[PDB]
Design a protein around this ligand. Structure first.
Ligand SMILES: CCCCCCCCCC(=O)N(CCO)C[C@@H](O)[C@@H](O)[C@@H](O)[C@@H](O)CO
Ligand SMILES: CCCCCCCCCC(=O)N(CCO)C[C@@H](O)[C@@H](O)[C@@H](O)[C@@H](O)CO
Ligand SMILES: CCCCCCCCCC(=O)N(CCO)C[C@@H](O)[C@@H](O)[C@@H](O)[C@@H](O)CO
Ligand SMILES: CCCCCCCCCC(=O)N(CCO)C[C@@H](O)[C@@H](O)[C@@H](O)[C@@H](O)CO
Ligand code: NA
Lengths: 91, 91, 91, 91
């Protein structure tokens, strides 16, 4: 259960470093510092305005931005679901 | 578990072909190419701006668009939930 | 499992009759016919733009609209969660 | 199961008192009265427009508002998930 929570933190930092690099210069309010990034990725992770509010405007500059965001969503939603059941089994 | 993941991909391509056909000419940024469709159907699948963002503007041209989108949502949300538990049982 | 699915349909029709009555005259695009209602309640049920997009504008006319929507959300989210596990137990 | 539901109500009132205090004077429509707060915290709890709708505009005045909202989200989403499974185990 704790191994999954650690794995998520590692994945979350790698993607926030990557996003900062790719979309920072073009989208500064969303991916400027690594701090702005980790916040935006959590927002995308909870699904809140992920497409109409972040991905669609980003794709208007980077047409393949979906190759980054869609897998990140599928991964973090699977990891969170796997982490959720870990607590369920332990009880 | 893998049989459900394959079934979802087949259903996702059939609906992405159908939407392209029905709402393509009228809503090109959302359903123009099959690719544009697959992206918008995933957005609808995650529930992100499905109604206010997509369905409501579409229904202003196609008043029965809800006959397509509502079942797609109920189906994909059931399939994902069934796929989620498949991994849980196997653990 | 089927008893819960029937219970939800009964609850969904009662609330769509009630909403049509309360907020129809003031909010016609959202609660005009019972048809417009059943669509909006499903949108609220999936959580899509429930507060900023429906409840907050409604409360600007009906300050207690939250007494209707919040319980409907808590009820339908519990019923769907109970219906979800029903399929899980049967497998 | 009932102990978790009581714990959530206590946590929801403490955060609703805190938010009222911190973001009340600056954001009155969202955190003016404790009542206005309890409604906005539930909206954030369901994830509806949490970031683009509330947190991002709040952070434009209080740059560290994320220290309050992100943990509240992680806590209430864990508590609700734990409360959900409590009913599942008892069945
Ligand atoms: C797992 C979730 C991790 C969340 C980390 C959030 C870190 C946020 C932060 O440190 N900010 C700087 C606070 O000084 C806010 C920025 O994200 C950004 O919103 C601003 O820079 C305005 O842009
Ligand atoms: C299951 C989810 C499938 C997702 C497929 C996305 C395909 C997106 C794509 O190929 N685009 C064209 C970029 O080459 C982006 C468009 O959707 C916009 O214009
Ligand atoms: C469980 C979910 C039940 C969903 C039922 C949807 C019924 C929708 C319907 O029959 N409409 C009339 C189609 O002619 C659409 C209206 O909801 C509304 O969007 C329009 O009247 C524009 O307003
Ligand atoms: C747990 C969820 C608690 C929800 C409490 C909602 C209280 C809402 C309320 O009393 N209002 C004043 C109407 O009397 C509406 C305001 O939130 C707006 O102005
Ligand atoms: Na959502």
């Amino acid at each position: 259960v704790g191994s999954v929570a650690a794995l998520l933190t590692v994945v979350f930092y790698i993607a926030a470093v990557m996003a900062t690099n790719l979309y920072g210069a073009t989208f500064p309010e969303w991916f400027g510092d690594l701090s702005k990034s980790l916040y935006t990725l959590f927002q995308v992770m909870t699904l809140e305005s992920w497409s109409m509010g972040i991905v669609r405007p980003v794709m208007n500059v980077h047409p393949n931005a979906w190759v980054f965001f869609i897998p990140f969503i599928m991964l973090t939603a699977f990891t969170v679901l796997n982490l959720a059941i870990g607590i369920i089994v332990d009880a």
